[PDB]
Design a protein around this ligand. Structure first.
Ligand SMILES: COc1ccccc1-c1nnc(N)o1
Ligand SMILES: [Cl-]
Length: 115
């Protein structure tokens, strides 16, 4: 069902290396709905190429636009399994400290802060 489950470690590594070659300015991001999640919809895809200069605050705005949320629906984003310490950090910096061993940056969203 989940991305890590659908693709072998070897396959995720090779795909990160292709994005390096073909989209060298992009951060490879996996974005997944919390398996408990009731309110928010699922995204139309799993794998996102994010411009390495956007900060986490702008990535939250991007995802909320992709879900076509309205102003008072709540949205919480975990990165590498934990809360974001700050939304002002550029994604190139967040990537270097929170990337997985396969080379993707893993995110999960929910309407509850209690995931
Ligand atoms: C640490 O990365 C590698 C290690 C061994 C062989 C290839 C790579 C690689 N990285 N990006 C591409 N396109 O290939
Ligand atoms: Cl690029």
């Amino acid at each position: 069902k989940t991305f890590k489950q659908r693709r072998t470690f070897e396959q995720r590594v090779e795909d990160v290396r292709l994005i390096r070659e073909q989209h060298p300015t992009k951060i490879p991001v996996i974005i997944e709905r919390y398996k408990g999640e009731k309110q928010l919809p699922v995204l139309d895809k799993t794998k996102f190429l994010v411009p390495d200069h956007v900060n986490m605050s702008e990535l939250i705005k991007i995802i909320r636009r992709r879900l076509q949320l309205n102003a008072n629906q709540a949205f919480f984003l975990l990165v590498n399994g934990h809360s974001m310490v700050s939304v002002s950090t550029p994604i190139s910096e967040v990537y270097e400290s929170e990337k997985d061993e396969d080379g993707f940056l893993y995110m999960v969203y929910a309407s509850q802060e209690t995931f």
